[PDB]
Amino acid sequence: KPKLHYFNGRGRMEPIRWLLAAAGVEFEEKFIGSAEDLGKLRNDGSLMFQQVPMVEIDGMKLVQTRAILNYIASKYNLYGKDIKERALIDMYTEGMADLNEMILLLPLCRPEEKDAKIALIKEKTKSRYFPAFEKVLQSHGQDYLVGNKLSRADISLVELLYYVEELDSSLISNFPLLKALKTRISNLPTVKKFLQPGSPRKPPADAKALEEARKIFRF
Amino acid sequence: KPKLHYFNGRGRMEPIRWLLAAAGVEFEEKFIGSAEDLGKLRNDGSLMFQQVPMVEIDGMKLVQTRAILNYIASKYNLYGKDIKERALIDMYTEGMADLNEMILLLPLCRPEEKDAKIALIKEKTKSRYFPAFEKVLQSHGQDYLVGNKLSRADISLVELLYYVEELDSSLISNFPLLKALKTRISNLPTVKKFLQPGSPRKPPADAKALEEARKIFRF
Numbered sequence: 054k055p056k057l058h059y060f061n062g063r064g065r066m067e068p069i070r071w072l073l074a075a076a077g078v079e080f081e082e083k084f085i086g087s088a089e090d091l092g093k094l095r096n097d098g099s100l101m102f103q104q105v106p107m108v109e110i111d112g113m114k115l116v117q118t119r120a121i122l123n124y125i126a127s128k129y130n131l132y133g134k135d136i137k138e139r140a141l142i143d144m145y146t147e148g149m150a151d152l153n154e155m156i157l158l159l160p161l162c163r164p165e166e167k168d169a170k171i172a173l174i175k176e177k178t179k180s181r182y183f184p185a186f187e188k189v190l191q192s193h194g195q196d197y198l199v200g201n202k203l204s205r206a207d208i209s210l211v212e213l214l215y216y217v218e219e220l221d222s223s224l225i226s227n228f229p230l231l232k233a234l235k236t237r238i239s240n241l242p243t244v245k246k247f248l249q250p251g252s253p254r255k256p257p258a259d260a261k262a263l264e265e266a267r268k269i270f271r272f
Numbered sequence: 273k274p275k276l277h278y279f280n281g282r283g284r285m286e287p288i289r290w291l292l293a294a295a296g297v298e299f300e301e302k303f304i305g306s307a308e309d310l311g312k313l314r315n316d317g318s319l320m321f322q323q324v325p326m327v328e329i330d331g332m333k334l335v336q337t338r339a340i341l342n343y344i345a346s347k348y349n350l351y352g353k354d355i356k357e358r359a360l361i362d363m364y365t366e367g368m369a370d371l372n373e374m375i376l377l378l379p380l381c382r383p384e385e386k387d388a389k390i391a392l393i394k395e396k397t398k399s400r401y402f403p404a405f406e407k408v409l410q411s412h413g414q415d416y417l418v419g420n421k422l423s424r425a426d427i428s429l430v431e432l433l434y435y436v437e438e439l440d441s442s443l444i445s446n447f448p449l450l451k452a453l454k455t456r457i458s459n460l461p462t463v464k465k466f467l468q469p470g471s472p473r474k475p476p477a478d479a480k481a482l483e484e485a486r487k488i489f490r491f
């Protein structure tokens with residue numbers, strides 16, 4: 054079983070949970086609860102750049118979110134079939150990560166800057182990201198972003214669609230094909246199960262989650 | 273020939289210049305000098321997420337730095353021999369990208385916070401990043417970071433050592449093997465040519481370029 058080292062929360066680990074769970078892969082989680090827990094992982098040599106996410110998989114102590122996601126996608130056949138499909142999948146997922154980063158860091162914005170950030174997220178979602186992925190689905194008319202087949206790109210996008218819905222559920226309103234994709238993916242037995250109660254899926258960060266992470270990571 | 277669409281400066285495009293050059297690949301550049309130039313690329317449907325870097329390669333219009341790098345690396349066999357070597361390469365280059373990001377965004381720092389950021393970059397270089405990579409070279413005693421063969425990891429790291437050197441030339445002084453890798457890689461015929469005066473290699477950003485970039489990208 055791959056073992057995921059992180060705090061008990063979404064942060065940067067969440068896409069990894071999604072992708073493993075979607076690929077039907079059973080995993081264990083070792084929850085970092087304090088500066089001491091992280092401290093031990095640092096002193097053991099387990100963390101190349103002394104940071105997490107870290108995942109023990111196939112003899113490796115893999116750090117860096119993109120390194121872990123790339124490996125998992127390749128291992129479990131969710132990374133297309135060739136170099137051109139990987140280019141499409143990389144381009145798509147990098148775009149999704151850019152929007153993810155904005156949403157991710159929102160709790161760090163001061164009360165006076167928060168409203169401007171939220172408005173920028175909404176506007177970019179509507180004019181930059183959602184148009185781009187709707188255009189790819191519209192252009193080829195297929196059920197999946199790339200190669201008419203389930204990839205890490207579809208899995209990354211649907212997780213994102215759920216975070217956007219948490220923010221503002223009307224953002225997806227003028228994107229029929231994105232709506233249809235979210236539904237399609239959500240019904241896949243592995244995704245459906247991940248979205249059910251009691252799965253390793255993590256909740257949105259709240260006030261105390263930010264307090265707790267600050268005392269673990271020192272930011 | 274690939275064509276690289278960017279302003280005339282390092283920014284995010286520079287590692288793609290380094291990688292293409294190191295692979296022995298001649299490329300052209302189309303320099304964005306105004307906001308109207310950038311606007312035309314956007315309006316013509318050329319930028320998937322309305323942004324550069326964009327690279328025309330083998331007919332395709334690839335955006336997203338990491339997508340472009342992955343493609344070029346796969347194509348020219350600088351991405352290791354298998355899934356596990358790609359995992360090491362991904363992990364190593366993501367760590368270098370983190371340090372690179374700090375250096376890259378330094379000119380954006382408000383005057384009151386810039387000194388704190390410089391000392392942070394220096395401290396992390398010496399205790400986080402350089403020791404990590406000195407350790408990899410220690411782990412196998414070979415002349416390349418991964419798989420005993422030139423990869424995109426060697427090329428990304430050597431570019432990074434050159435920037436660290438532009439910041440503070442003493443930072444690498446306690447890292448024998450990194451010094452040696454910098455010399456070896458710099459003497460590879462393709463990289464030696466790229467490092468020659470008058471090549472596509474770009475200057476460090478100065479105040480003028482920051483002003484010029486602001487007019488173009490409106491950040």
Ligand SMILES: C[C@]12CCC(=O)C=C1CC[C@@H]1[C@@H]2CC[C@]2(C)C(=O)CC[C@@H]12
Binds near residue numbers: 064065158160263
């Ligand atoms: C990305 C981040 C900041 C930079 C850093 O060093 C490490 C973290 C991990 C915890 C994140 C945090 C951002 C804010 C988050 C999402 C919360 O509100 C709860 C957990 C927390």
Ligand SMILES: C[C@]12CCC(=O)C=C1CC[C@@H]1[C@@H]2CC[C@]2(C)C(=O)CC[C@@H]12
Binds near residue numbers: 489
């Ligand atoms: C990466 C960047 C910021 C985010 C953004 O929106 C657009 C750019 C492009 C120009 C970069 C700049 C960062 C600072 C740079 C390196 C300079 O000092 C000269 C040019 C400039």
Ligand SMILES: N[C@H](CCC(=O)N[C@@H](CS)C(=O)NCC(=O)O)C(=O)O
Binds near residue numbers: 103118270
């Ligand atoms: N490049 C990022 C690094 C993320 C990161 O900065 N990790 C945080 C938690 S999400 C951490 O362990 N920070 C502690 C530290 O910097 O010492 C990745 O995808 O892994």
Ligand SMILES: N[C@H](CCC(=O)N[C@@H](CS)C(=O)NCC(=O)O)C(=O)O
Binds near residue numbers: 335336338489
């Ligand atoms: N995720 C980045 C996105 C690139 C990016 O932020 N592009 C900048 C220039 S370096 C830009 O076009 N800025 C204007 C904008 O975001 O609209 C990448 O790796 O390419």
